[PDB]
Structures are given as structure tokens and as C-alpha cells.
Design a protein around this nucleic acid. Sequence first.
DNA 1: CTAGGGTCCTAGGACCC
DNA 2: GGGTCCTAGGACCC
Length: 342
Amino acid sequence: GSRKIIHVDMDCFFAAVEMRDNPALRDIPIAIGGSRERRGVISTANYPARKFGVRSAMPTGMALKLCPHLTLLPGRFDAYKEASNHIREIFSRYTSRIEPLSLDEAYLDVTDSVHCHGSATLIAQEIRQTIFNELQLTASAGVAPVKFLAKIASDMNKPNGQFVITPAEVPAFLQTLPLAKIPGVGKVSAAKLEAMGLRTCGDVQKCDLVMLLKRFGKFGRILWERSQGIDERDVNSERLRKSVGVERTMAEDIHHWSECEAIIERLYPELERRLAKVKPDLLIARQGVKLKFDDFQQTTQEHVWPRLNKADLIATARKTWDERRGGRGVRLVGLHVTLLDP
DNA sequence: CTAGGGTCCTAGGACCC
DNA sequence: GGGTCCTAGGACCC
Ligand SMILES: Cc1cn([C@H]2C[C@H](O)[C@@H](COP(=O)(O)OP(=O)(O)NP(=O)(O)O)O2)c(=O)[nH]c1=O
Ligand SMILES: [Mg+2]
Ligand SMILES: [Mg+2]
């Protein structure tokens, strides 16, 4: 009853696209990210930049201190999206069981594929090659009997590599695996687990399910399952986007509502333009706003509303501004929309 | 010195029976 | 007394 799941993952996806499109960035540390003055962070970076410690989600200010010759690129999301469409169409040549997770990665369920004599190892390789031959970018891949093990495996031979985990290899692979490597166990959860003596899946295997359920809820059940290789989630392939949001972080904290409203006026056309791509009639389920203050607390207020409407967003923003801001500076304003169900 | 695009889970009160 | 919706917040992913 064992299935074959491939996880494909582009190498330094945005950076790799920028070097293809301008070879001059090939051997210099580059990074896609807002400038220091724009208070931005690194989206991604190439390997000459991560040699210096540059990571995704790092404040640009901290990147430039580690890597003073970093080259900041603004990013060209149409170029990234075109490559994403291309790779996904490459996936289609092999199976329709494709669940994309972002521009640059997808799960594939190749169980009932008889490409490459049903070898998932050689299907994964034949996709990386091909991506290489047709897009001049590289991908890493992971092959395992379940989703999360396949995702972990795609980082172990990154860049331009892959890694296979057979069911017979699963128990030994699990035994020393830090919990934080499990997709969905982040920093906060890992630090709680660590603080009661749980670091690896082998640790959680010595744990009672009931206790984990009491301490963590459904997350505790997830944690006990994954700790044993149990991950029965199917590769979906028909997930649909449920929301679209637009938010902006100013270079300077705003302190006056005239500043906020002017920002909303620039945000709204963008949100409308993007909603129309997926809902021409702008018919929606809910709309709302987001403010992030200078103490980094953030708040949203949204409500049932039937159609993208600028004035109600301005209205509810003004309300949020007055009712919850306490004279703090505001670093970010965002608009939001929850899409209708079908 | 802390982005912007998202997803999913939780939790109290409203509302319903 | 038990479901289901509404909203806010937050952990987490890319
Ligand atoms: C994690 C992350 C990613 N991104 C963008 C930029 C990345 O190029 C793209 C793919 O995300 P990955 O996690 O796959 O990292 P990567 O750049 O492709 N490097 P890697 O996959 O080789 O580790 O998605 C961001 O903008 N912010 C992020 O935090
Ligand atoms: Mg990647
Ligand atoms: Mg990825």
C-alpha cells in the first residue's frame, strides 16, 4: 500500500532567475529584498551571499552588516511566475497529481505513474533535468512514501540534487530527526518542545498520545503522527486561493490619519486590479484592513461585505486608527479580502 | 532591526434548537 | 444543554 511522493523545489528560486537573466550576478553575492531605507528583508539570496550568513527573512540591515557588497535586487514577480508556470507544466507531463505550495515547489504523487518504469527516483531526476534543459535553472527533489518526509528530503541534497527515503529507511531517518525540521514545527513550537525535553522524533515516540493531545491539541496529534512517519495527507491538486491582500511598509512611521488615508488610496487600485484577475465582478465574502504599529503589535478588522469597496475600507481603517493605536506610530497599512467559497 | 504573498488553528460570544 | 457562524489573533509557510 505504499505510495511514491516527490517534492520538487527550485534552488534559490528568485536569485537563480536573476542570474540566468543577467549572468553578471552569477558569482557576486546578490539578494532579492527591499533596501535598508525601505526597512525591508531578504526574500532570497544566492550561494555567494549565504556564504556570509545571508538568509531568507533576515532584515536587510543585518544582511548588509554580514555582507557589505550584497547587491539588492527589487525582484520581477512576472519572471518568477513564468518560470513557475513552466515547471508546473513540466510536472504535468508526468502526472496530474500536482499540489503546488508556492511559485517554486510542488508535491507530486507518482504512485500510478508508469513513467520511468515506475521509478520515482528516475522520475524526479528526469524532471530536474528538463527543468535544467528548458528553463536554465536547477531544482532539488525529495522522494519518500509521505508528503513531509519527501519535503525534508528535498533539502538534504540541495542545490541540484535529490534524496530518497524508502520505507525501510524511515525508522532510522526518524530517530535523530529534530522536530523543528518537520514542516509546521516552527521556532515557537520547537522552543516549547525543547523546554520539556523533546528535540527529535525519537523523543516524541517515547511520548503518550493523550498527554500530547492535552498539551497541544490537534498539533499534538500531528506531532505524534509525524514522529512515526505517519502522514496520510493526500496530494490534493484542487486547492483554490481563499484570500487576497495588499499591504505596504513605509520607510517612515506615519503618525497622522491623512498619511494613512493617502496610503490606502494608493493600495486600493492594486487590490482591485488583482481581485479582478480572479473575480471580474469583484464579488467577495469579506473585506478588511490591517495596521502594524511601531511596537510591532498588529491588528486586523474585517467584516462580511459583498463587493470590493474603497470607502468602506477607508471607513473601517479610520475606525481602527482611532479605536486602537494609542498614539503609536504606524509602520504598515494593509487591505484584505476573503473570497467567496466556490 | 525586523516584507509581502498566503494557509490553517483556536477561541469566545452570537445565534439557533 | 450541543452545533455553526463571526471575528481577531497568531504560528507558520514560501
Ligand atoms: C522562505 C521565503 C521564500 N521567499 C521567496 C523567495 C524564494 O526564492 C522563493 C522560494 O522559497 P524557498 O523556501 O524554496 O527558498 P529558495 O530561494 O528557493 N532557496 P532554496 O529552496 O534553494 O533553499 O520564495 C520569500 O520571499 N520569503 C521567504 O521567507
Ligand atoms: Mg526553493
Ligand atoms: Mg520552496
